[PDB]
Amino acid sequence: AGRFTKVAAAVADSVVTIESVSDQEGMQGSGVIVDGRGYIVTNAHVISEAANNPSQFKTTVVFNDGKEVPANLVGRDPKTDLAVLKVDNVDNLTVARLGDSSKVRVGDEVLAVGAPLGLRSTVTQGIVSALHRPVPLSGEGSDTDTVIDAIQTDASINHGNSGGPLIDMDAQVIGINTALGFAIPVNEMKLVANSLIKDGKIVHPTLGISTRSVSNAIASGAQVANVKAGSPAQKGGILENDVIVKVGNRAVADSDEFVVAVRQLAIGQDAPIEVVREGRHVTLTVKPDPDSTLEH
Amino acid sequence: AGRFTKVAAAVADSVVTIESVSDQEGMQGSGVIVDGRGYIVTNAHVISEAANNPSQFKTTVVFNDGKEVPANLVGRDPKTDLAVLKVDNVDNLTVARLGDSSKVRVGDEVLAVGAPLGLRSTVTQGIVSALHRPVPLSGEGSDTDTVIDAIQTDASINHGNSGGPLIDMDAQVIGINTALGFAIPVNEMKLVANSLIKDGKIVHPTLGISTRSVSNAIASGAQVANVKAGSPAQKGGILENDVIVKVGNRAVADSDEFVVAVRQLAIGQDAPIEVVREGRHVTLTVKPDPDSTLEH
Amino acid sequence: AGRFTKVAAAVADSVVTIESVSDQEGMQGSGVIVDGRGYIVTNAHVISEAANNPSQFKTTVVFNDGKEVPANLVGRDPKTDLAVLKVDNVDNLTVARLGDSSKVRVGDEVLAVGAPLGLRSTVTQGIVSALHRPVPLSGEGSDTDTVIDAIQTDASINHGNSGGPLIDMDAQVIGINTALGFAIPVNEMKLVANSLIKDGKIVHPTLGISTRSVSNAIASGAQVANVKAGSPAQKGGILENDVIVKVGNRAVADSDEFVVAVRQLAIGQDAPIEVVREGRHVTLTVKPDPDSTLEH
């Protein structure tokens, strides 16, 4: 039995097809069983239509054995492109083994595994091409766009394995395949999926800033395009045309890294923002606000 | 010597360049030697121009040793994208070893091998991404479009290895590369190539139906778009707007699977077709006709 | 540690980020340390803007350890898409180990390694798909287009690893990644980089011919589209509409191979050119001129 054939077969029982159907449309994605109680992780694109139109869409989970079971949305995070479903009272679930994405290295051989019974399902193979790679993701429909620190791989990521797991050579989940490919790292998945299970919602920091990327010999980074009124950046002293070069402890190369670095800040705590303003370096102090004040 | 280098070198003598030339045009593809008498298998796209315009096109086979030899069309099957050529009285041919595509599993490492002396020739590597995957194929010019149960692979399939073999790690042919890539499985190739050698033609079942894919919460499958007059479906009771969900022993997910499932039926024998008609499940009995009545 | 993880980690210290910046723009590529004195090889596309606009662009080299150092252009060859930079008085450089591209075989596993600290950096994996493959390359801006005998690979070649090394399983450089991917072979790199270091310039043969590819049953090859006045082909007897089929000791399949074969000729020495002229085979004798008369 082939080296990858063994790994793909070892995780197949833990990967599921996620099907949302109305009486006029129907889409399919993949997900991974992450808890014996019936919790399933996918990406926010796979469920986007059912989450946004729950009156007309019904979501089911199809297992490796062919069983079809109703599924309910536990919670979703368009900002990290993650979501959690729940199947109730399903016995003998084969829960996937979650790895540690902090131990993943460039060159590691990986499999991007889609649901074995999906219509256009795929299983692809490659290596890890980059780590902590900020990548912009387009929201599927009415979902807002976002940027994530992704694991980059030259394994093909497509409709046939979107939402399925990125698997290392120990048959462990190291990532969730997004919609030259990218995956949400499993350690960030664990944090997001746990809070979506405790709270049904994730609260992310916000500053009230929109940026555009700039790269030149003076000052490269994320140039402040807009500051919202009454925003944390508004009170912290951030001004337009400022070129943000550092957010907290993370240097910011462009707008993509800016979005990701902001989400690493602590809500309600002072934090430094370094900018280049009219050719002058300036450090500012900002207290991020929660993006969802009622859930915080 | 590399693991894949050994396999690619082991099959090179069995892979040939197929060149068809007129006095104003010329194209190249790949093929594989499948019988010591000089029979060579390629896909129907590679020869399409010479088969359709034999008065102006001449076809030759170029071997690994550089020998160039005239080739004649034994037969072709646009419906399975397969074709057989013949070289006459060529000695010491290195016949390829044909595998068993029913033993191929998802994750198996494969090589998509093009003719070593072809102009744009390639050899690519990947894994098997899916099995029994219905894929639509566009006829090259005046050839009719078709759908086949393919082996899907993330090994690149391109002009440089089209018509060449898909090779497993035992240096065995498990498929024929088509024109994210697909290959005709070798077991289906054997059946088609044998009949093209006995009969010079393949006879496929037909029902007289055109379908369009549908996917919703009521009834997903292949919706009947048209029924030909006097067709087997016409006498079997199939009506327009019927959503076919099963053909024989094979469930039908969409139009792609419908085309493939029909070709698995027995000519002249009764067979069940399950449909959803105005929200009502109905089973029908159809006797498929041969698509080529004179060869049958 | 993974098989490819070890190789990628072993060469990382020898791969550098190459950053050219003006006060309004900035681009990044990869390069490889090839000599302890501080010589770095990249492709001509990576530096194209700084080489063409040196008054406004500044080039730096970023090492694996994060050190940033000024770099100076030693020389470039748009015709082979190669270039050499120099860092001065940098100690403890990890020089890459240069392989022998003549020992590379089809199917060899390779890594296309980009600079570890580059913004969009990638490391991709594949096999060698073809050897001595003439490929046309578009000049980046005002640089002239060219054709090279490349190593073809199904490892992804992109902006994130352009200019970085193509690495074999012995952690040796066998090629330079260009801008389904292609790399300049290391043996041709050695010749070009050495002359760019001795002379600051490379001198290539020229005949004064422009060709277009032709492929038919009469005569396939590179059809002479234009002959420059006073050119070596002009004095050698080459005429328009001639279909060149051999240049020196190398048969010419199309215009791509013609460009490459011409560059293999000896400057100032008689050489045969075989053509098909009005359906008649004709051999001609041409004495190539240097493309840069003052440097020759």
UniProtKB/Swiss-Prot annotation, chains A, B, C:
User: Is the keyword Iron in the record?
Assistant: no
Q: What is its EC number?
A: 3.4.21.107
Q: Please give, as recorded in its UniProt entry, the membrane topology of this protein.
A: Single-pass membrane protein
**Record's superkingdom?**
Bacteria
Q: Which intervals lie on the Periplasmic side per UniProt? A: 1-293
Catalytic reaction list: Acts on substrates that are at least partially unfolded. The cleavage site P1 residue is normally between a pair of hydrophobic residues, such as Val-|-Val
Name where it mostly resides. Answer: membrane
Q: Where is the PDZ domain?
A: 191-252
Q: Which UniProt keywords apply?
A: Cell inner membrane, Cell membrane, Hydrolase, Membrane, Protease, Serine protease, Transmembrane, Transmembrane helix
Q: Say which enzyme class the record assigns.
A: hydrolase
Signal peptide residue numbers: none
Active-site residues, Swiss-Prot/TrEMBL: H45 (charge relay system), D81 (charge relay system), S162 (charge relay system)
- GO CC entries: peptidoglycan-based cell wall; plasma membrane
* Compartments where located: Cell inner membrane
A biological process (GO) of this protein is:
proteolysis
Query: Molecular function (GO) terms listed?
Result: serine-type endopeptidase activity
Q: What does this protein do?
A: Essential protein that may act as a regulatory protease that is conditionally activated upon appropriate environmental triggers.
Q: What is known of its domains?
A: The periplasmic region consists of a protease domain (PD) and a PDZ domain, connected by a ten-residue linker. Interactions between the PDZ domain and the catalytic domain lead to an inactive conformation.
Tell me, how does this one assemble? The C-terminal region exhibits both monomeric and trimeric forms in solution.
Family statement: Belongs to the peptidase S1C family.
Q: What is this protein called?
A: Probable serine protease HtrA1
Q: Which organism is it from?
A: Mycobacterium tuberculosis (strain ATCC 25618 / H37Rv)
- Organism placement in taxonomy: Bacteria, Bacillati, Actinomycetota, Actinomycetes, Mycobacteriales
Gene encoding this chain?
htrA1
